[PDB]
Design a protein around this nucleic acid. Structure first.
Ligand SMILES: [Mg+2]
Ligand SMILES: [Mg+2]
Ligand SMILES: [Mg+2]
Ligand SMILES: [Mg+2]
Ligand SMILES: [Mg+2]
Ligand SMILES: [Mg+2]
Ligand SMILES: [Mg+2]
Ligand SMILES: [Mg+2]
Ligand SMILES: [Mg+2]
Ligand SMILES: [Mg+2]
Ligand SMILES: [Mg+2]
Ligand SMILES: [Mg+2]
Ligand SMILES: [Mg+2]
Ligand SMILES: [Mg+2]
Ligand SMILES: [Mg+2]
Ligand SMILES: [Mg+2]
Ligand SMILES: [Mg+2]
Ligand SMILES: [Mg+2]
Ligand SMILES: [Mg+2]
Ligand SMILES: [Mg+2]
Ligand SMILES: [Mg+2]
Ligand SMILES: [Mg+2]
Ligand SMILES: [Mg+2]
Ligand SMILES: [Mg+2]
Ligand SMILES: [Mg+2]
Ligand SMILES: [Mg+2]
Ligand SMILES: [Mg+2]
Ligand SMILES: [Mg+2]
Ligand SMILES: [Mg+2]
Ligand SMILES: [Mg+2]
Ligand SMILES: [Mg+2]
Ligand SMILES: [Mg+2]
Ligand SMILES: [Mg+2]
Ligand SMILES: [Mg+2]
Ligand SMILES: [Mg+2]
Ligand SMILES: [Mg+2]
Ligand SMILES: [Mg+2]
Ligand SMILES: [Mg+2]
Ligand SMILES: [Mg+2]
Ligand SMILES: [Mg+2]
Ligand SMILES: [Mg+2]
Ligand SMILES: [Mg+2]
Ligand SMILES: [Mg+2]
Ligand SMILES: [Mg+2]
Ligand SMILES: [Mg+2]
Ligand SMILES: [Mg+2]
Ligand SMILES: [Mg+2]
Ligand SMILES: [Mg+2]
Ligand SMILES: [Mg+2]
Ligand SMILES: [Mg+2]
Ligand SMILES: [Mg+2]
Ligand SMILES: [Mg+2]
Ligand SMILES: [Mg+2]
Ligand SMILES: [Mg+2]
Ligand SMILES: [Mg+2]
Ligand SMILES: [Mg+2]
Ligand SMILES: [Mg+2]
Ligand SMILES: [Mg+2]
Ligand SMILES: [Mg+2]
Ligand SMILES: [Mg+2]
Ligand SMILES: [Mg+2]
Ligand SMILES: [Mg+2]
Ligand SMILES: [Mg+2]
Ligand SMILES: [Mg+2]
Ligand SMILES: [Mg+2]
Ligand SMILES: [Mg+2]
Ligand SMILES: [Mg+2]
Ligand SMILES: [Mg+2]
Ligand SMILES: [Mg+2]
Ligand SMILES: [Mg+2]
Ligand SMILES: [Mg+2]
Ligand SMILES: [Mg+2]
Ligand SMILES: [Mg+2]
Ligand SMILES: [Mg+2]
Ligand SMILES: [Mg+2]
Ligand SMILES: [Mg+2]
Ligand SMILES: [Mg+2]
Ligand SMILES: [Mg+2]
Ligand SMILES: [Mg+2]
Ligand SMILES: [Mg+2]
Ligand SMILES: [Mg+2]
Ligand SMILES: [Mg+2]
Ligand SMILES: [Mg+2]
Ligand SMILES: [Mg+2]
Ligand SMILES: [Mg+2]
Ligand SMILES: [Mg+2]
Ligand SMILES: [Mg+2]
Ligand SMILES: [Mg+2]
Ligand SMILES: [Mg+2]
Ligand SMILES: [Mg+2]
Ligand SMILES: [Mg+2]
Ligand SMILES: [Mg+2]
Ligand SMILES: [Mg+2]
Ligand SMILES: [Mg+2]
Ligand SMILES: [Mg+2]
Ligand SMILES: [Mg+2]
Ligand SMILES: [Mg+2]
Lengths: 275, 48, 92
RNA sequence: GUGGUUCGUGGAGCCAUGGGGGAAUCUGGGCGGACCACCGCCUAAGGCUAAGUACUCCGGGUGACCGAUAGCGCACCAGUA
RNA sequence: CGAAUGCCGGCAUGAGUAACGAUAAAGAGGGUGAGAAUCCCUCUCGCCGUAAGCCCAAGGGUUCCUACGCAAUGGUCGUCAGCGUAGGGUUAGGCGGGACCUAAGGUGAAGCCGAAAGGCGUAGCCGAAGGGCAGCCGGUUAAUAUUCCGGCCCUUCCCGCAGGUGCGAUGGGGGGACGCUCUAGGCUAGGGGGACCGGAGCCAUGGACGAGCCCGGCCAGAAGCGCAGGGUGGGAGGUAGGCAAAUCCGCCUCCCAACAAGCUCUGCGUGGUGGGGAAGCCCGUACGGGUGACAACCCCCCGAAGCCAGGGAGCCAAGAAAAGCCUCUAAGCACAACCUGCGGGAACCCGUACCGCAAACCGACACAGGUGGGCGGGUGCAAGAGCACUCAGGCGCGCGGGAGAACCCUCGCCAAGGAACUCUGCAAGUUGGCCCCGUAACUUCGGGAGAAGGGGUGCUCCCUGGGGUGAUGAGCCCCGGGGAGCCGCAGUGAACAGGCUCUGGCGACUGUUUACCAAAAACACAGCUCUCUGCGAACUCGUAAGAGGAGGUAUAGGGAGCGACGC
C-alpha cells in the first residue's frame, strides 16, 4: 500500500510514506556486515561536480553481496528483510548454514524463513542465483552481471528486473528494465525473481523538505539566471528560452544523443528503448 | 555588526605559519622575500 | 651540573612563609624537570626531597626610553623536604 | 607538422625535430639557398677543454655626486613604528 | 614657482561655536590633600536583578596585588584608575591538554600521473569542543588553590612475598555503538511553609508581650546495609564461516531456565566521622576579626529539561570511527609469564594571574553595535526564561551649575466634529489575558474560528465535591460546584496584552533573495512533461593520474521547461 494522511496541514494532504510491512522483522542493521561509514560529499577534490546535492540525513552503509558465486553450493536461510537507506530496494539479511552472514538486495516474494542458494545446480526459484546459461529462457531475473565475475550491475532498483529472451552461443539475450535488448555472456550470474518494493515509484514526497531530507538541494532553472550563469539566462522580464534548449554548459538538451559512437559495447546490444 | 577579524590562534598558525609557508614553492618564496628584505618577523607573530 | 639546576633562592614574603614546613622555593633552569630538581636539591643541600611543585614565571615586559623589551622568563621550584629537615643555607 | 636564421610560404636551401617510411662505411655520406651536371668544401648521428667575456652582496680608491623635503626606504636602535 | 582639487610641513578661519557618547538620578556629613561635584567612609535616594548578578570556553597578554606618583592617556576634574616607576603574585598522579583513540580533512610506505614546479594515492600517521581516563568537602593569601594545608577517598606503573592459571597479540570475535518525537517509575539539584529547635535584640505613632517581628535551621562522607533502576540467559553436542591458527564468535540440534532469578554495574538514602554555622551588637578609614551561640542543625510540602541511561513506546528521513575494556588463541614460552592479595617504592611536560555580553575580546576610541555554553532566588498575574516589584550581587552610566524663550526630539491630555487629512487613516489611537455563550459565504471537509456578536472578571462570609502526599484521620498541596452580601467612575483596577469586516490582483501552502535604498507577482517548492544514460553510464573537474556521479544500476543519473490541486 502506502500511507496517506488527512489534510491536517497543507502538504500533509499530499505526502504519502512507504508501507513498511515487507520490511519490519528488523530495524538496527547487522552491526557486522554494515560497519562502514558512508562517506558523504557532493563533489570531488573541493569542486562541485554534481549540482544541488548535500544536507540530508546521516547514513550507515550496509555492504551487500553483488556476486554470489563466492558461496556456490552453501545454502543460506533468510534471516530478515531490512530497510536500506542507500537504495530503492530493501535488503534481505541471510544466514548461511556456513555461519557467515550476508546482505542480498531483497527480491520480490522472498520471505523470512525461506532458503536460498547459488550455483549451476541451484533450484530455479526466487532468491537463488545462477549463471545465466543455466536459467530457463523466459525466466524473470534481477541483479544480473554484465560481464562474468565483475559483479551485479543490471536490474537492481526497486521493482525492476530483466527477462531472458533466448540463448545463442556463450551468450544469452536479455530484455533490460529499460526495454533494451542486450546480449549478456552466459557465464554472467543473475538471481531469479524481480527486485521488489515495486511500490517505491508511487510515494509522493509532499513538500520541499523531505526532498531536503533525501539530500536533494533546490534546483534553480536556467531562465532564473543571468547570462554569465547559463545560456538560458538574461532577458528583460521572463524570457522564452531563445532557441535552443541547452544546459548550463552549452550542449543542447532536447533529443541530442550522447552515447559514445564507436563504443565496442555496441554489437552486444540489439534493441534500444521505450517511447 | 559582526566584523571581519575573528581572532583564532589555531587558524592563524595553520594558515600563515612557518610550516605552512614551507609546504609550497609559493610560500617558500614569501620567506625568501621577507628575509631578503630583512623583515624582523618572517611569519605572523603568534603563540599559544 | 647539579649546581647548574638551582640558580638561586627566591627571597620574598611568600617564599619565606614556606620555611616553617619543609618548603623551600628556588629559581631553577627553565627546562629543569621536577625529578631533575629533586636530585639537584638532594645533593646540593644534603636533604631528602619528597615533593616538588613548579610553575613558570613569564618575564615582565619593561620599557626604558623608546626602547621596549621583556625580562627573561623563569621557572620557580618549591621543593618540600622530608619531615623535620632544614636547608641550613636558606635559614636566616 | 613546426622551431631557429635577416627569411612572415617565399624560387626556401641550411641547422634542430613531434609523425611515417627507412640506408650505406670512403666505389661511403653531408654542404656550397629549389633542382640537375660540372668544379670544389667538409667528415654527422660519443665526451672533455684553460684564457679573453658577464656581475657586484663584500673590501678599497676616486668624484665640475647629495648635503637631512637632498642622498639608499633608513646619516638617528628602520625594513623598525 | 603663485597657481597643477599639486607634494611634505607649519599655522590660521569657522569658534570660545557643535559637541563631552544612551533621560537609571541624585543629596548631605565627615576624611584626605597645595588643590578635588569627580578619591575614601557614613547615611539617605534611584537603576538592573533570564540583569546591568555569578561561572566556563575563545580572544587578550600582566590589564592581577601593593607601595610611591599625576606630565601625559581619562572627552571635565582627579589626591583616583584598567595610566608612570618599582616589588610581589599563577604551586596538580586525580582539573584541562600531552607520554591514548579515531572523525571530516590533511599527510603519505607501495603505486599512478604530469615540460619543470608539481597533481593524485593504498597501508600508516597527524587531526577534537567526539571516545578513554583515578578528587569531593573545607581552611588559608594583599594577590593561587579539586593545585598549598586539613579530613576523607582513589589511579596507574616497578620490586618483593604468598596463592591461583596455559600465559602469551600490534591478528580473530564481543564490546565500545550512537536518530527524531513523545514518555514511566524512582530519586537529586532547587524552592515554599513549620504553632517546631537555635539566636543577638525589637514593642515605635493609637493597638499588640501576641502562633508577634527578625535570622538560621546546611555540606562532604569509604566499607557495609536500603531504595530505585541499567546490563546480562545457563547446558551439552556438531561445525564448510569470522581470507580457519582458537576452547572465542557465528551458524545448526536438545537435556534446563524463561513480565524473573542470580551474578554484575551505576544512581540516590544512610553511613565511623570531618566541616560549615544568620540577623544583630562590638572592633575597623582600609581588609576583615570577634561574634554567637558548646548555635540549632529537625518536620511537612512542590519539584526538574538533571541522575538511574545503554530505560520504554511510537515514527521514517533509518541515525561515526577507533582505542581503552572482556574474550580467543599464533609465534613464542611454560624455573617465562599473566591474574588476585599484601607489603615497599615510582608517578614526568604545558596550562593555572587577571578581563571574559565587556572600559581588558572583534569594531582606529573607556564606541548605545557583535560575542558560544552553564547558574540565574521570592511574590503576583492561568502558564513561562513573559510582565511589575524585589533577594544575593552590581550599578546611577567619567563634565557640572543654572534658566522655564522660539524651535527640535520623546511623552501626556483636549470642547464640538470624526478621515473633512493625505499619493495612502501614513502616524497615532481603538481592540487586547482568561472564562462562558455564540458564530456567515465558501471548502480540498483539515479549514474560514480568536470569524463576527455579545456576557462575565474585585472582595467578604456560608456550604459542598473531587484528587496528590500522610495513613484511609489531620496538615500541606491541587483543581472545582452552589449561596448570600460589600465598595468604587472603574475589579486581567498597575505592567506584559489582535481593531473588525466585505471585495479584487498575484503566487498555492511553510520557506529563499539584491550583508549597506527594492522581501516582491521575484528564487525555491512538492507535482507534471520532454530528453540523454546499457554502467569503464551519461554529465562535471582535471593536461594526466584520478575523482564526483555511486561503493548507485531504468521505481537510477544528468539536463531542460512548467510549477499544489481542478478542468
Ligand atoms: Mg582531498
Ligand atoms: Mg527550479
Ligand atoms: Mg534575474
Ligand atoms: Mg552564454
Ligand atoms: Mg560551471
Ligand atoms: Mg583590523
Ligand atoms: Mg574555524
Ligand atoms: Mg598585525
Ligand atoms: Mg604545573
Ligand atoms: Mg620561422
Ligand atoms: Mg622554416
Ligand atoms: Mg622525426
Ligand atoms: Mg622521424
Ligand atoms: Mg645535412
Ligand atoms: Mg639536406
Ligand atoms: Mg644540398
Ligand atoms: Mg658549403
Ligand atoms: Mg649553389
Ligand atoms: Mg664545408
Ligand atoms: Mg665529436
Ligand atoms: Mg667526434
Ligand atoms: Mg662543454
Ligand atoms: Mg667550459
Ligand atoms: Mg667588473
Ligand atoms: Mg631622507
Ligand atoms: Mg636644516
Ligand atoms: Mg644604509
Ligand atoms: Mg624617506
Ligand atoms: Mg605651493
Ligand atoms: Mg604661472
Ligand atoms: Mg600650491
Ligand atoms: Mg597641508
Ligand atoms: Mg578660533
Ligand atoms: Mg559663549
Ligand atoms: Mg556660529
Ligand atoms: Mg548656539
Ligand atoms: Mg551645547
Ligand atoms: Mg557620559
Ligand atoms: Mg549624557
Ligand atoms: Mg523609572
Ligand atoms: Mg527596580
Ligand atoms: Mg524581564
Ligand atoms: Mg587564555
Ligand atoms: Mg603595563
Ligand atoms: Mg588594579
Ligand atoms: Mg595610592
Ligand atoms: Mg584631564
Ligand atoms: Mg599600574
Ligand atoms: Mg598523539
Ligand atoms: Mg597529496
Ligand atoms: Mg587517506
Ligand atoms: Mg592515530
Ligand atoms: Mg580529546
Ligand atoms: Mg573528552
Ligand atoms: Mg581571584
Ligand atoms: Mg589534598
Ligand atoms: Mg589463555
Ligand atoms: Mg569490532
Ligand atoms: Mg523561620
Ligand atoms: Mg523561638
Ligand atoms: Mg503606643
Ligand atoms: Mg525555612
Ligand atoms: Mg551522603
Ligand atoms: Mg548524607
Ligand atoms: Mg525527567
Ligand atoms: Mg591504531
Ligand atoms: Mg618526558
Ligand atoms: Mg582564576
Ligand atoms: Mg551584548
Ligand atoms: Mg554567555
Ligand atoms: Mg565611559
Ligand atoms: Mg560596548
Ligand atoms: Mg547571542
Ligand atoms: Mg508562581
Ligand atoms: Mg500570564
Ligand atoms: Mg543591595
Ligand atoms: Mg565615556
Ligand atoms: Mg477631541
Ligand atoms: Mg469628546
Ligand atoms: Mg479624501
Ligand atoms: Mg483635500
Ligand atoms: Mg497604521
Ligand atoms: Mg475590592
Ligand atoms: Mg513528591
Ligand atoms: Mg495580557
Ligand atoms: Mg493578543
Ligand atoms: Mg501580538
Ligand atoms: Mg508566496
Ligand atoms: Mg512566507
Ligand atoms: Mg541565509
Ligand atoms: Mg538591501
Ligand atoms: Mg538575510
Ligand atoms: Mg516578506
Ligand atoms: Mg527592506
Ligand atoms: Mg581526459
Ligand atoms: Mg562511491
Ligand atoms: Mg515559472
Amino acid at each position: 500500500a502506502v500511507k496517506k494522511f488527512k489534510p491536517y496541514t497543507p502538504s500533509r494532504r499530499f505526502m504519502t510514506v512507504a508501507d513498511f510491512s515487507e520490511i519490519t522483522k528488523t530495524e538496527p542493521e547487522k552491526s557486522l556486515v554494515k560497519p562502514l561509514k558512508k562517506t558523504g560529499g557532493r563533489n570531488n577534490q573541493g569542486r562541485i561536480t554534481v549540482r544541488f546535492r548535500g544536507g540530508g540525513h546521516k547514513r550507515l552503509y550496509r555492504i551487500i553481496d553483488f556476486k554470489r558465486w563466492d558461496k556456490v553450493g552453501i545454502p543460506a536461510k533468510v534471516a530478515a528483510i531490512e530497510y536500506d537507506p542507500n537504495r530503492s530496494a530493501r535488503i534481505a539479511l541471510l544466514h548461511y548454514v556456513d555461519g557467515e552472514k550476508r546482505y542480498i538486495i531483497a527480491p520480490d516474494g522472498l520471505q523470512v524463513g525461506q532458503q536460498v542458494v547459488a550455483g549451476p545446480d541451484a533450484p530455479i526459484q526466487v532468491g537463488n542465483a545462477l549463471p545465466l546459461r543455466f536459467i530457463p529462457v523466459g525466466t524473470v531475473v534481477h541483479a544480473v552481471e554484465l560481464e562474468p565475475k565483475k559483479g551485479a550491475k543490471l536490474a537492481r532498483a526497486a521493482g525492476t528486473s530483466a527477462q531472458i529472451q533466448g540463448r545463442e552461443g556463450d551468450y544469452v539475450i536479455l530484455r533490460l528494465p529499460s526495454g533494451e535488448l542486450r546480449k549478456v555472456h552466459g557465464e554472467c550470474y543473475a538471481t531469479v525473481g524481480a527486485v521488489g518494493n515495486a511500490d517505491h515509484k508511487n510515494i509522493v514526497l509532499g513538500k520541499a523538505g523531505r526532498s531536503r531530507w533525501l539530500g536533494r538541494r533546490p534546483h534553480v532553472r536556467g531562465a532564473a539566471m543571468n547570462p554569465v550563469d547559463h545560456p538560458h539566462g538574461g532577458g528583460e522580464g521572463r524570457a522564452p528560452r531563445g532557441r535552443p534548449p541547452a544546459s548550463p554548459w552549452g550542449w543542447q538538451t532536447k533529443g541530442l544523443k550522447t552515447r559514445k559512437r564507436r563504443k565496442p559495447s555496441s554489437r552486444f546490444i540489439i534493441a534500444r528503448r521505450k517511447k | 555588526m559582526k566584523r571581519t577579524w575573528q581572532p583564532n590562534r589555531r587558524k592563524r598558525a595553520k594558515t600563515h605559519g612557518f610550516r605552512a609557508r614551507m609546504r609550497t614553492p609559493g610560500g617558500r618564496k614569501v620567506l625568501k622575500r621577507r628575509r631578503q628584505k630583512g623583515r624582523w618577523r618572517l611569519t605572523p607573530a603568534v603563540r599559544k | 651540573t647539579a649546581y647548574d639546576v638551582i640558580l638561586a633562592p627566591v627571597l620574598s614574603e611568600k617564599a619565606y612563609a614556606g620555611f616553617a614546613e619543609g618548603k623551600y622555593t628556588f629559581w631553577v633552569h627553565p627546562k629543569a624537570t621536577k625529578t631533575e630538581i629533586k636530585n639537584a636539591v638532594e645533593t646540593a643541600f644534603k636533604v631528602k626531597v619528597v615533593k616538588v611543585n613548579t610553575l613558570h614565571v613569564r618575564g615582565k615586559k619593561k620599557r626604558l626610553g623608546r626602547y621596549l623589551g621583556k625580562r627573561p622568563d623563569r621557572k620557580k621550584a618549591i621543593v618540600q623536604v622530608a619531615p623535620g629537615q632544614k636547608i641550613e643555607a636558606l635559614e636566616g
